[PDB]
Design a protein around this ligand. Structure first.
Ligand SMILES: O[C@@H]1[C@@H]2OC[C@H]1NC[C@@H]2O
Ligand SMILES: O[C@@H]1[C@@H]2OC[C@H]1NC[C@@H]2O
Ligand SMILES: [Cl-]
Ligand SMILES: [Cl-]
Ligand SMILES: [Cl-]
Ligand SMILES: [Cl-]
Ligand code: NA
Ligand code: NA
Ligand code: NA
Ligand code: NA
Lengths: 659, 659
């Protein structure tokens, strides 16, 4: 066995298989290689017949493991063997393990692959590494899926219905699969993931040039590997997260940097990535944004109101569209009657053309002077205001629809025919914004802007055009927001609408929300709830009680998103957000979310500490539970220590009024 | 055209294509053939290269259409043509259209299929028939997906976040797909579906011997057919539901019976199927079940309580399992402190072996005498009691696990290796129940039983053994329940736990819950909420306010499902259920749900009328809304007219207590 060792880690590499273990010498915890098959890696490739197979590369005909520098071990896997015993002659995978001389850090890189006459597809490398043994390790996988989740490595008490779904999912396909980086759907928002137990933590950070996928296995014993053969899995239930290198498309450096943290958990992992986030240039603080634009200080304590008039989906839809006088009266009511001191008013439906032609201000809704009266009233309150804007859609029902501005692929076929909100090639979007946005800014005296869709993901195709648009919008120095966001866009915006949770998502029944993204970026980007899952709707992610409490724990702002006819029914939730969430949001807005903790065995009682001197404890479940010192937190209750020394305690109550 | 006609309907059959239209003569409404491609049917079959292709059978080389009896047209589609111009020589499809001589009913049957040297798979027939034109027809598709949904054929006002998801889904793949019959997952619980507009309704009833799937297309213009070619769809937005005959599997009679109802909607469709349900023998009334067993009258007004002790998933799990004295004290508190007058107590975790060995009563939990003490207390209150029982699982973590009782398929491979709760072959399950259930009935003096898993679906494979088990359980004449249920099991049980809604399901963002199953079967089977999604949990299906109101509209009972540590948090919901839902459940229990109506444009205000003389109006959204007569229903509010003429009005309020 070949050893790399420094003061902090011992890497033990098996010369027969290329598998390796990592001893974290402070805690003494040992991370084992693949517990199931002793596979260093899992390679998907075509056979002689053109059929895809997945093979254990530790079964290759020749495996060469040599110490090639003081702290580098080079590995080569030559001529893998298929299930029938034929050989993939001429195929090979070369990798390197590089131990930092001083730090508890191990770089792992796929340096070369050779396909011969076959075709190489997925490579899981390292395979089923850094795993947790279910119900032996008491820890979790840590996955930055949108705002982020943890997946405990053991079964624990919880509501009976939740428990049945949770345990069942660890025995079927719900607990295995893969996610991608930097999308606004099911995927990851930061290029890292990790595992920890009560002794030690490990996380891996993906090279900035690479786009592996992430395979997950959450307490599953691998029965999914055996269902087609109709036999029972012989393997043990474990938790692992693996990189999937897409050998058929990846042109970047296939490197992942593992960082080992004695006694660490998901908080420590997030703080390690926060250093890398700064080095990558993503981290531009809200304090720096405020120095550039004093109006950023209209955001702390603001409720984000989306008044949804059926636009962009329809122009002047009966029963949905608001007139500009109606918009003014909603703003007046929010301030004068509901006493909301700070607000971001976002009016969806102010133009008489379909996006991406964001003009003119609609005559049918009252015309420019009446919109200006509404915006002026909002400004007189100190509120931020934006219309709905988008430069990416090309909509079937728009009389101006054309395919002129849609992108085509190499075969001349239209792209995004299945995604109507993202059809305009980004290389045209700055020019579309230039058609009217300066006119609207000048006429309405705008202080703010929100732009939809374009910055919800960070994909390679079209990135240059998106950057051009972001730089143009940023050049106006408005308080500005965008849908969902990604870390790469943080330099250009003050707020993201979203970066919370999908309602239906892989892992939903076997994970707990954890504020991973905000543990990294709360000081750099403000976030609010998503308009599809706002704080006034009851969804898989909770009702108002749960969402208000989670908002304060995670450091996000309230979103109230409604059709005009619903407005009277929003009043009680606006008042509760005003009294409970808004003062905490205001106090914590610029601060670091220093720590988050789960304080109850069912993960429903949680404690967040912010560098404003604010501590938020809340109980997201129905039953009162005790914490340290015999302090009781009511069901749907909170205990919040403010910087001014006051202690806010209380809880939500549902009551039945029988007349 | 060939014409079949009676006093009610004119069937216009195109001799060149085999397509047909149906004129409903009293309204003048014409149901059209396929609006997109004029296809009588869509056949999937292999080509000469063995690759699957889907073809329009109206493009076949020879189409024969002739009147072969007074009210029968015979069609034959001979030698379909592939997209490359080659011919599926020797393939043919024979169908018949048979008009009832008197009634507005058309039978449509695939009578013969010949594959030659090709292989046949799906046949949609009739293809894209009985469609609704989006935003012109103001009606809905009607789909008995679990309890049931309707899908409106037009866009309407609703909450902004819901609206965005709804409208977007009609343009992407969320609005097209297929569902299967008689499962407990995403599929249908009755073998019918339909469409209606403001003039006319049509529904199709699938022959009892057949298992087609059902294709849906909910306001989609067919863009999914063109995405791979990268072109924009040239078709219009429509609603349709098609049978998919599985030619490779189906051995039954491939017949669907269309019933045409002037002025009808989903209520009239349900009442048509109710007559068929009675003719099929599924309908055994709760009044008849009460005559056989007077203890059935312990169900009306009963809350169903599941005390979830971590079993069957684990034996005596710390932090989840209750002792029998703890169980007794929960029952006592429910009666004495919470004043619950009727209840079904269901205790999950009474045995010290894993299911399917439902014995002995656990010594570690206090032993048989202590369980008998808790059951005796429940009986002294007039409550129903059952332990958790299951005869179908074979669990990995059971020391007694064996594959001996698992089923093997035609290849000799184990079945359900990925489905641990349904691994025992049904042909063994009566013998497993016989091992101890009569001992438990005798020792505890049981009046009730609930059996998990086995009756949640109605698949062909294993149905004989499931019927044998159902007959055996039924022979005890206990008040009895089972998980989820299907119509075919109604003769054997008094209640179903479930028959409501999955949390995550196809069509969720573009449909409204409708009580289709209970419009048929409320007089014959009682249902309660599902334990995974109980009324004390906040899910995609609502919080307690929404679920309590929907329960009264739909005629189901309350489910409170909790781990023991949660009990104190359940108290407010138990009290509200007791005050609001239980008296209405009690009054309506045995009655017919005669009608259900949506009374507001956003479908959130609804009115149900029961043959007890009870009327429930409720508002499942947040804003007060007015109905006929200017009567206002508050948000999360109700107006209930009881049998004796008294009026109950009220609403739920969420409030924030701040110390
Ligand atoms: O987890 C499930 C749950 O207990 C066993 C599983 N089968 C049906 C019950 O609802
Ligand atoms: O429906 C969507 C919604 O408005 C247009 C779509 N794009 C993003 C917004 O959240
Ligand atoms: Cl875009
Ligand atoms: Cl959140
Ligand atoms: Cl079964
Ligand atoms: Cl329901
Ligand atoms: Na999966
Ligand atoms: Na800005
Ligand atoms: Na679909
Ligand atoms: Na019975």
């Amino acid at each position: 066995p070949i050893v790399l060792e420094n003061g902090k880690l011992n890497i033990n590499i098996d010369s027969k298989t290329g598998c390796f273990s990592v001893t974290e010498k402070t805690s003494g915890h040992v991370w084992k290689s693949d517990p199931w098959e002793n596979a260093a890696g899992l390679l998907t490739l075509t056979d002689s017949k053109g059929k895809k197979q997945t093979v254990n590369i530790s079964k290759s005909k020749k495996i060469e493991v040599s110490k090639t520098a003081k702290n580098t071990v080079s590995l080569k896997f030559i001529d893998p063997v298929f299930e029938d015993g034929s050989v993939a002659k001429g195929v090979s995978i070369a990798t390197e393990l590089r131990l930092d001389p001083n730090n508890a850090q191990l770089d792992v890189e796929v340096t070369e692959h050779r396909s011969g006459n076959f075709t190489l597809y997925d490579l899981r490398y390292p395979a089923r590494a850094f795993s947790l043994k279910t119900d032996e390790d008491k820890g979790a996988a840590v996955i930055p899926q949108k705002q982020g989740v943890i997946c405990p490595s053991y079964i624990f008490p919880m509501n009976g219905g939740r428990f049945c779904k949770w345990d069942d999912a660890t025995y079927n396909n719900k607990s295995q699969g893969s996610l991608e980086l930097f999308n606004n759907g099911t995927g990851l928002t930061m290029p890292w993931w990790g595992t920890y137990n009560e002794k030690s933590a490990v996380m891996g950070i993906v090279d900035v040039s690479a786009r592996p996928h992430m395979q997950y296995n959450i307490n599953n014993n691998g029965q999914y590997l055996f269902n087609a053969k109709g036999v029972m899995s012989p393997y043990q239930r474990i938790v692992f997260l693996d990189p999937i290198w897409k050998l058929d498309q990846e042109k970047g450096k296939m490197r992942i940097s593992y960082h080992f943290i004695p006694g660490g958990d998901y908080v420590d992992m997030a703080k390690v990535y926060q250093k890398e986030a700064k080095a990558r240039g993503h981290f531009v603080s809200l304090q720096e944004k405020l120095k550039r634009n004093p109006n950023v200080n209209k955001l702390p304590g603001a409720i984000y109101f989306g008044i949804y008039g059926g636009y962009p989906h329809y122009v002047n839809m009966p029963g949905m569209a608001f007139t500009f006088d109606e918009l003014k009266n909603i703003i007046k009511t929010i301030h004068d009657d509901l006493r909301v001191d700070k607000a971001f008013v976002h009016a969806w439906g102010t133009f008489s053309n379909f996006v991406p032609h964001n003009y003119p201000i609609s005559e049918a809704l009252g015309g420019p002077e009446k919109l200006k009266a509404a915006v002026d009233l909002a400004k007189s309150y100190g509120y931020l205001y934006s219309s709905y804007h988008a430069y990416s859609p090309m909509l079937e029902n728009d009389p101006n629809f054309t395919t002129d501005l849609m992108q085509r692929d190499a075969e001349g076929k239209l792209m995004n025919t299945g995604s109507r909100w993202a059809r305009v090639d980004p290389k045209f979007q700055k020019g579309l914004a230039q058609k009217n946005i300066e006119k609207e800014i000048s006429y309405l005296g705008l202080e703010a802007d929100i732009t939809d869709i374009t910055f919800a993901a960070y994909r390679e195709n079209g990135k240059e055009g998106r950057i051009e648009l972001a730089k143009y919008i940023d050049s106006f120095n408005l308080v500005n927001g965008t849908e969902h966001g990604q870390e790469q866009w943080i330099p250009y915006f003050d707020m993201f609408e979203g970066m919370t949770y999908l309602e239906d998502r892989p892992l939903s029944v076997i994970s707990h929300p954890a504020p991973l993204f905000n543990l990294v970026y709360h000081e750099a980007i403000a976030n609010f709830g998503k308009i599809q899952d706002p704080d006034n709707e009851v969804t898989a992610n909770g009702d108002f009680r749960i969402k208000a409490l989670r908002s304060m724990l995670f450091g996000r702002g309230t979103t109230i998103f409604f059709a005009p006819y619903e407005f009277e029914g929003m009043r009680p939730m606006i008042e509760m957000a005003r009294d409970l969430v808004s003062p905490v949001h205001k106090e914590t807005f610029y601060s670091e979310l220093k720590s988050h903790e789960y304080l109850s065995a069912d993960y429903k009682v949680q404690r967040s500490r912010f560098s404003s001197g604010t501590e938020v404890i809340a109980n997201l479940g129905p039953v009162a539970q005790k914490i340290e010192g015999g302090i009781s937190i009511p069901g749907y209750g909170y205990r919040i220590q403010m910087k001014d020394g006051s202690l806010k305690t209380g809880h939500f109550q549902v009551s039945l009024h029988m007349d």
